[PDB]
Amino acid sequence: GLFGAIAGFIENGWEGLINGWYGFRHQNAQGEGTAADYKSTQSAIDQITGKLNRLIGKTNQQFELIDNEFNEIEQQIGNVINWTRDAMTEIWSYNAELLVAMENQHTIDLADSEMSKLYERVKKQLRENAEEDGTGCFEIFHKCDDQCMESIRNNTYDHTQYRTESLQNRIQ
Amino acid sequence: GLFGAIAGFIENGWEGLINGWYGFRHQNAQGEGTAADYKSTQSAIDQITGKLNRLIGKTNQQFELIDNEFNEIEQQIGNVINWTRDAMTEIWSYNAELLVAMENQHTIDLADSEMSKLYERVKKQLRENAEEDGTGCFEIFHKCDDQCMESIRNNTYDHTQYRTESLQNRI
Amino acid sequence: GLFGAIAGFIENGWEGLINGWYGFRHQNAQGEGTAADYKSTQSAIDQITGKLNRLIGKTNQQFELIDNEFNEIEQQIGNVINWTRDAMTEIWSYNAELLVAMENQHTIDLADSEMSKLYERVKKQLRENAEEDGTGCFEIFHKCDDQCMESIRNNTYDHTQYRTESLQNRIQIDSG
Amino acid sequence: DKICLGHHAVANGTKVNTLTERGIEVVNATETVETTNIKKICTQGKRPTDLGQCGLLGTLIGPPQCDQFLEFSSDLIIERREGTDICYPGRFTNEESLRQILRRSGGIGKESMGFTYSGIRTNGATSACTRSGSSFYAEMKWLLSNSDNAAFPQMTKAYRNPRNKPALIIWGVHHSESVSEQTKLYGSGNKLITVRSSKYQQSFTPNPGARRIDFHWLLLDPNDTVTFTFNGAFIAPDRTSFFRGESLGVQSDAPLDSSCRGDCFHSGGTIVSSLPFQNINSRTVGKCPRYVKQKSLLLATGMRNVPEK
Amino acid sequence: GDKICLGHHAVANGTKVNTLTERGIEVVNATETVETTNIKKICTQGKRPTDLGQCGLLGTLIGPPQCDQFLEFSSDLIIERREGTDICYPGRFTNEESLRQILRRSGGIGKESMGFTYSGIRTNGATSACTRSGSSFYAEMKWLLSNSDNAAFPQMTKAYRNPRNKPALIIWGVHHSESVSEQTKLYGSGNKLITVRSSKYQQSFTPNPGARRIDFHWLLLDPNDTVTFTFNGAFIAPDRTSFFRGESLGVQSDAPLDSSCRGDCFHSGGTIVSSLPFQNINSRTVGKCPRYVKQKSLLLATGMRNVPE
Amino acid sequence: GDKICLGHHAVANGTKVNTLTERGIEVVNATETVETTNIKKICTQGKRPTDLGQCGLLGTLIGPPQCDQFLEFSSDLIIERREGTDICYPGRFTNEESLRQILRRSGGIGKESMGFTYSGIRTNGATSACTRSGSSFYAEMKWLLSNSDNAAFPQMTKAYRNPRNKPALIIWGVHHSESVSEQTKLYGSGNKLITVRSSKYQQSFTPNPGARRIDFHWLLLDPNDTVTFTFNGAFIAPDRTSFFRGESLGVQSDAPLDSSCRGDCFHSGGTIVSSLPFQNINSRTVGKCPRYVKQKSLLLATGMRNVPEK
Ligand SMILES: CC(=O)N[C@@H]1[C@@H](O)[C@H](O[C@@H]2O[C@H](CO)[C@H](O)[C@H](O[C@]3(C(=O)O)C[C@H](O)[C@@H](NC(C)=O)[C@H]([C@H](O)[C@H](O)CO)O3)[C@H]2O)[C@@H](CO)O[C@H]1O
Ligand SMILES: CC(=O)N[C@@H]1[C@@H](O)[C@H](O[C@@H]2O[C@H](CO)[C@H](O)[C@H](O[C@]3(C(=O)O)C[C@H](O)[C@@H](NC(C)=O)[C@H]([C@H](O)[C@H](O)CO)O3)[C@H]2O)[C@@H](CO)O[C@H]1O
Ligand SMILES: *[C@@H]1O[C@H](CO)[C@@H](O[C@@H]2O[C@H](CO)[C@@H](O)[C@H](O)[C@H]2NC(C)=O)[C@H](O)[C@H]1NC(C)=O
Ligand SMILES: *[C@@H]1O[C@H](CO)[C@@H](O[C@@H]2O[C@H](CO)[C@@H](O)[C@H](O)[C@H]2NC(C)=O)[C@H](O)[C@H]1NC(C)=O
Ligand SMILES: *[C@@H]1O[C@H](CO)[C@@H](O)[C@H](O)[C@H]1NC(C)=O
Ligand SMILES: *[C@@H]1O[C@H](CO)[C@@H](O)[C@H](O)[C@H]1NC(C)=O
Ligand SMILES: *[C@@H]1O[C@H](CO)[C@@H](O)[C@H](O)[C@H]1NC(C)=O
Ligand SMILES: *[C@@H]1O[C@H](CO)[C@@H](O)[C@H](O)[C@H]1NC(C)=O
């Protein structure tokens, strides 16, 4: 999309992330693990819900019969009605298709945006303790156990705690 | 916000910033200081003005009376007109609702974009002399007086002048 | 643009880049050189073409005459017809104006997006071996000859190869 | 050690269209075009009237078929294919205008206008309108001369609207079978019917040659008066109609069902949907999703699907 | 340590707007796009208005007393009023609304004599229904009749060529007497026949006695074309014909005129003065108007997302 | 030292377009979405056109001398001309415009004898207004009148059942004489009534004498349904009825035919050949056409923002 993450620098999606829309996949000495990010996922869902609240369950306005199936009306009025109705149909068909096309373009870009935001959040969080590898991953230049990995997802990671160690590894 | 700056990593706006739309707030050995950025502010205002030019002061089509308020016209034709008119009401009501919704979505994202562009401008400007807070702030690793702060604002800051000082403060 | 590259931090376009939409201009000991980027150019074209497919060559809607251009029909029904037609003209002129305006906004921003994407992609490739000057260039902190430049363009650049030379030129202080 | 960011995907996504792409695959999508029709008239919550054999306009004048519908009260008037307005040949002028007023009328209440006669007949009947022998339109009086070829006297009957809502006035012009048929029923020579109010005048002459009774009508304002002047060939109203409230008129071959609720109707039944559009019927009545030509228009409700390889 | 922080402005008290994604999200500033502010007047500044009042628009052609002051008039804004009437003697125009539509945009009418003079008949037909310091008639018309009770009205032919650059609005009347004997009184005895003929129009009229009315009929006569009248009684003849001046807008209202406001969008209850693209004031308008919408308010954002301190 | 720069293309002079926020912003390339190029001809290539010329479309049903060459015709593109005339004898079709609309899309017409034979009346009613080798009449019609001046025209009944698989276009005329005397001469004295009845249609007609004319009326007769004519005079009877062939377009235009260009969108000023979504040429069009818009130009950006070099 417009933001370059989903279907961009991030190769593909994870089918095993049944717990949310976006997430983290860590890798340390204890093995790998996957956790879903609530905040980013809920943000995306709320926006799609927004779209649904707009389009679904609207209060339509009343229309009556203006012609007759059982007793054909005078030919002149009838033809004008047929001409008007069909032209309405053409406008509404146009409007409907455009609406969906436009909304979908925005939805995909919206989802891509939320991925980009989350990625960028982690980057700013990790400061000088990590380098981005270009596939959406962050190479941590210190040792980060399951609790440490937690503190990144949890957004409670104190970069000062790990800074000196990681700078030594980045430079050597 | 598609760009995640306004109502994103920037916690809130500044009610004290009566100067413009976007700005800088700095801390040093001389106290706090707030100033507006002209370039970005004007860029956002100019675009919103652009939307208004499109919607306001439009020339319209002339429409005549096809109906009679004082003398009821044949109900056959009357009901057709009323049907058409109501259908037009249904179409324009939709168009109008969608137009405003779509425009508002964009305006919000557009403004957010300008904030991010300004923040990114400053990031590239500061090079290896600063680090990101995460809240929209740049932690400067050298002593930056009021003149140094202004240089950052009006894009004349020379990162070379402070690089040696910054890097050794960063270890 | 929404992404701040085109008409943004990149000062201006290159009139000499006739081989594509997006490109690389390098400077090294061997000289200057310009090359197009295919992946980014074609992604922007495919998206534009997509728009053209939606609007050009469509199956048109069917039309029939309800008026008489030789002998005016009765005034009343004739006035109703004109009224309805003009209303249709009003709707379609609005649709057309808006569609085109909305598309052009997205189109410009889309193209800007791709420029940003290609820029960020290169940024990620170079890792800790280069810095952004703020004008759309990366200052490379190691000798990068024509082949090295090539490896950046075709995405085969291995930053590990050049890291030690780079950090020596980047971190120009004593490390204790 | 490393932390990697990513997003969900499914094996089988849903293809949707965007501004730049056709059939791009997303995680999930929802239909916006309703295509499920209920082949019934959903009458739950309503007070429906199925006219059946009775034509909507027949309810006003009362041929045998509409004896059951002289006074109806409904909010959903269902017209059927087999409905006829007449028994004796003829037709209403501006017939569709009158139907359109009736369909939304909320039903009709009848009230006696109170016309009495002397020196003439009021017992006019026909074999075409059979109702236990030979009879006529239940709300109409057929006026003749006292015997064959007798003179019909110039007459004036007037009705003032007592109620606080408009009254529907109907009257008939009997066109005789032949020139001498007209003189047998009524007087000799030229016949004329004048109908006046504060905002309506029109005169009527009979045209003999093909037997028929044509019906004409007007809407009389509160406290206003209809003046009838006639010397023959005149079918007189015995009762007038007052509208009850609000209703919705439907034309359909669909059966009524009082166990489903609905608000949008068409000839093929009821459309029940929260969706913005429908591909079911371009001609609908009531509160409906807008008709579109497309069978399906999928709105994306998830990200771009990029599955694992 | 020193730091520079980036941010944006905000107000404590923002405006709630709707997006595609969110209902009632707070932005810094927003401007209305739906006009709801009406002016309960017909704004006539910069315009040349004609307030027809008691005169009905069609009356301007035939000239009942109500329309004496509008026999000729020049306007770009013709205003019709509920109390306006076209006639003094009972009767109606043929295709009345069609005529009203061409006249509303005529830019006013200029009158011209048709040069009809008569011999061997009376020209001074008058009625107490059209009073003008006594019994009078339609100002633009002549009621033709025999020299005395029951005298034969001579077979006549009257022709008029349109000597003008633009089409002439030709009018004539048929007089339907109260009785046959009355028709015999005013004109001769026997069949009465009126034929009107141009190169595009052909139609013959016979009076229908019993009715007591003067019905008007009309045609547009092309330049250099000729209208020929053939009659032997019951004919209400034109003395004058009409010519349109240019362009105008027709307005139907009960709102007083106001020379001190300017507008180009008019309706039943006044004038809409606005630059906004939409209006929720009246669905029925004339002139250059914002498009009617059923929403009271649709706020367009003119500022960023508002996030207070 | 060494450096690599990322950038994009530009041109010296780009094309101005409009966006949501900006007016006349310059992009690298753009394309027109509103068609303004008209072809001043009716493009008839790959079609079977019918240039009606002197003959009015409605005339093809009743058949005045000018429509002799069109009494039966087969087309997919019917071209009506300004000089076209439906009649010879004075008169008009009732509902003429809705009948024209039906005929324009008919695909042409085929004629079949209704098989009405007559006894005790004259059948050879003619007029010098319809000259065609002397005084003739409408080719598909029959002017019925009494055996001699003033004789009583007998009360009569004629019925025709549609024997085909498609609707029959039934046509009839009412003759309005110059005067009461002339009606009496042709059809006998007394009043006249014409009644036309099918299982869907029911109308009565009385002649209104005063000015010579024959007015035409019509109905569509369903397959297997019967039309019944009852009349004692002033009746113009059908001899043939019409059956439609398939599908066609009808244009009103004075534009010449051109068999060297293909087209599917037509109007009074010729042919619109376009693959564009909109057009500013004509609001009255027939066929497969772009939607009419009031704007002359709507340039769609097919490139990025143009930022020329300095
Ligand atoms: C209660 C009663 O019957 N009283 C009558 C009274 O009607 C009558 O007055 C005159 O009656 C004649 C009948 O022929 C007309 O109706 C007169 O109406 C006028 C009018 O409308 O003003 C007079 C006018 O001069 C006439 N115009 C002419 C002759 O060109 C018209 C005209 O004939 C009709 O409108 C045509 O339909 O009628 C009316 O005054 C008197 C006799 O004077 O006798 C009382 O007993
Ligand atoms: C100046 C003058 O007085 N000249 C007369 C002239 O009128 C007359 O010619 C005949 O006039 C009659 C009308 O009275 C018809 O118009 C005759 O023509 C036709 C026609 O072609 O239309 C002839 C045709 O045979 C008739 N068709 C019939 C009988 O079926 C029709 C028909 O009657 C009418 O059209 C119906 O309205 O009329 C025309 O020749 C001659 C006498 O021949 O005398 C001159 O001095
Ligand atoms: C409806 O509008 C059309 C034009 O849009 C009118 O048709 C013709 O317009 C032309 C040029 O403007 C005039 O020269 C003619 O006088 C009009 N008639 C014909 C037969 O070409 C038309 O008059 C309008 N309809 C009504 C009922 O007013
Ligand atoms: C994908 O979207 C569809 C809507 O098309 C969802 O289907 C609904 O599921 C809920 C239960 O969660 C039911 O109550 C509804 O009846 C379903 N609606 C329709 C129209 O079928 C579905 O939940 C979504 N799937 C996922 C995995 O989110
Ligand atoms: C209009 O369309 C309806 C429905 O398709 C059809 O039954 C009818 O014949 C048409 N009316 C006219 C006047 O063409
Ligand atoms: C159309 O609507 C108006 C009110 O807007 C109403 O007065 C009129 O009666 C309606 N016309 C018909 C034919 O029902
Ligand atoms: C914002 O919009 C409002 C309402 O349209 C206007 O009155 C106001 O002056 C504008 N500007 C500010 C700063 O509030
Ligand atoms: C520019 O646009 C035109 C159509 O407007 C098109 O023919 C062409 O392919 C485009 N590209 C170039 C390079 O001219």
Author numbering:
A (entry chain D): 1 to 172
B (entry chain F): 1 to 171
C (entry chain B): 1 to 176
D (entry chain C): 11 to 142, 144 to 158, 158A, 158B, 159 to 220, 229 to 261, 263 to 276, 276A, ...
E (entry chain E), F (entry chain A): 10 to 142, 144 to 158, 158A, 158B, 159 to 220, 229 to 261, 263 to 276, 276A, ...
What does the paper say about this structure?
The two membrane glycoproteins on the surface of influenza A virus, hemagglutinin (HA), which functions as the receptor binding and membrane fusion glycoprotein in cell entry, and neuraminidase (NA), which functions as the receptor destroying enzyme in virus release, form the basis for defining subtypes. Hemagglutinin binds to sialic acid (SA) glycans present on host cell surfaces. Here we report a detailed molecular analysis of the RBS of the HA from North American lineage H7N2 virus, NY107, including glycan microarray analyses and structural analyses of the HA in complex with an avian receptor analog (3′-Sialyl-N-acetyllactosamine, 3′SLN) and two human receptor analogs (6′-Sialyl-N-acetyllactosamine, 6′SLN; Sialyllacto-N-tetraose b, LSTb). The overall structure of NY107 is similar to other reported HA structures with a globular head containing the RBS and vestigial esterase domain, and a membrane proximal domain with its distinctive, central helical stalk and HA1/HA2 cleavage site.
For the avian receptor analog, 3′SLN, the electron density maps revealed well-ordered features for the Sia-1, Gal-2, and GlcNAc-3 in the NY107 HA complex structure. Structural comparison of NY107 HA binding to other, H1, H2, H3, H5, and H9 subtypes revealed that 3′SLN binding to NY107 resembled binding of the other published HAs. Indeed, the terminal Sia-1 moiety is positioned almost identically in all structures, and forms the majority of hydrogen bonds and contacts with residues in the RBS. Published avian HA structures with an intact 220-loop form very close interactions with Gal-2 of 3′SLN via residue Gln226 which is important in receptor specificity and host adaptation. In the NY107 HA structure, although Gln226 is absent and no other residue occupies the same space as Gln226, Arg220 does forms a hydrogen bond between Arg220 NH2 and Gal-2 O4. Interestingly, although there was interpretable density for the GlcNAc-3, no hydrogen bonding was apparent between the HA and the GlcNAc-3, which is consistent with other reported structures. Thus, for binding to avian receptors, the trans conformation of α2-3 linkages is essential and perhaps only the first two saccharides are required. In the absence of the 220-loop in NY107 HA, upon glycan binding the long side chain of Arg220 compensates for its loss and is displaced 4Å upward to form hydrogen bonds with receptor analogs inside the binding pocket. Arg220 of the HA1 chain of NY107 compensates for the loss of the 220-loop, by forming hydrogen bonds with Gal-2 from the avian analog (binding was not observed in either of the structures complexes with the human analogs). The Glu at position 186 is close to Arg220 and may interact with Arg220 when binding avian receptors.
